[PDB]
Amino acid sequence: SVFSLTGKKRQQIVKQVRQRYYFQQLSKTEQENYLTLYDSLAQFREIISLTPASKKSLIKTIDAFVMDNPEFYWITSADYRFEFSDQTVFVTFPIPEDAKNVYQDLQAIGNDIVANTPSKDRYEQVKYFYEVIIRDTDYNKKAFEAASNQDIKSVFIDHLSVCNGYAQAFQFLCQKAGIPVAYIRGTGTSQQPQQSFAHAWNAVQINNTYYGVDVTWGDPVFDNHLSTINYSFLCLPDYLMALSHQPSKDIAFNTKERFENVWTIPSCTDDSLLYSKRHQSYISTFDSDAILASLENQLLNRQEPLSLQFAHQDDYQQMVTDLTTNQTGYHNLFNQYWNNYTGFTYGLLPETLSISFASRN
């Protein structure tokens, strides 16, 4: 095809996209068009000429490209618009007038964040990116409770964003760091009160296995039940993430239609990177002794607030019931370590089977 990349430019683009997530699920012709899309958007073209395929194949290619490539911030929330003509498919992404300088503004910010990570351990880098986005970005709760908040410009330029921007910003940084990463879209479900909502989050590959990451839900303005940085959404297995997340495999390419069950979602099975597990606050079996010992170990390290995360729903629920009835074990322990003790308060985040404790005032 005349639109396929060639020469040195092709080599450069092949290297650039090799780790992109949805790219891996595209066929040969679709990957060629993906490469052409990358080159043309990197030249800041509004209209891209692609080689003809079925309507579905083109939508798959475009959808994969948009999810995979936050750097082209102007495409992240755009409609999928294309037209067939004379053995060519013309794809249009309206492009802002300042797109080149904003694109390079974001490159400089991203490069600075990645280059100065304190550790080069991949987990520590992922944790650092989580922290950076949460600390430096205001969550736009007014917007949620109701575009322009959906891309990495809203995160790194405006510092005011919603889940789609957070998740694309996390991918943006991971890509620059060379960490395989995915953007995942779907449905979040919160409790107290029960509620479902459109949502976006991430997966990362560390040590050749995937881990779930939800930066947005770790933001205290998004959810303050444990209030701060809520680490209980950092590198989760699916048996915990699935309690509040349902990823979508579908492509809704307009308001009336979709393609069902197109994409494969990363499988996250390892719990070894849980913050709670790494800090000896993960309870995998209901046991009063083990619960109090974990809290006492935290108290011996002079931590406040204390925290617990459970592996299994019914164990978390039994702990909740014991806190509404048998509280004596807890007062006896806390009174030993907290001065002027007059009780304790607790916060519940059932979405990750988590609880936090603090001295009452």
The residue ranges that bind Na ion (CB under 5 A) are 134, 137, 219
Residue, CB closest to Na ion: 219
Provide the minimum distance between the beta carbon of 228 and Na ion in the complex, in angstroms, as a whole number: 10
- Of the candidates 61, 2, 65, the one whose C-alpha atom is nearest the C-alpha of residue 29 is 61
3-state SS of the chain: helix, strand, coil percent to 5?
A: 45, 20, 35
By C-beta, is 13 or 109 nearer to Na ion?
A: 109
Query: Tokens standing for 239?
Result: 């048996």
Q: Kind of pairing, strands 181-190 and 282-283? A: unpaired
Half-sphere exposure at residue 305, Cβ-oriented, CA atoms within 13 angstroms: 20
By C-beta, is 139 or 330 nearer to Na ion?
A: 139
Provide the minimum distance between the beta carbon of 144 and Na ion in the complex, in angstroms, as a whole number: 13
- State yes or no: cis peptide before 193, omega within 30 of 0: yes
Provide the minimum distance between the beta carbon of 9 and Na ion in the complex, in angstroms, as a whole number: 39
Provide the minimum distance between the beta carbon of 24 and Na ion in the complex, in angstroms, as a whole number: 32
Provide the minimum distance between the beta carbon of 137 and Na ion in the complex, in angstroms, as a whole number: 5
How far is it, in rounded angstroms, from Cα 287 to Cα 318? 10
CB atoms within 10 A of CB 187: 13
By C-beta, is 165 or 188 nearer to Na ion?
A: 165
By C-beta, is 137 or 190 nearer to Na ion?
A: 137
Question: Is there a contact between 74 and 95 (Cβ–Cβ < 8 Å)?
Answer: yes
By C-beta, is 134 or 155 nearer to Na ion?
A: 134
By C-beta, is 71 or 219 nearer to Na ion?
A: 219
How far is it, in rounded angstroms, from Cα 212 to Cα 204? 7
Query: Tokens standing for 226?
Result: 């444990």
How far is it, in rounded angstroms, from Cα 232 to Cα 307? 10
Provide the minimum distance between the beta carbon of 231 and Na ion in the complex, in angstroms, as a whole number: 14
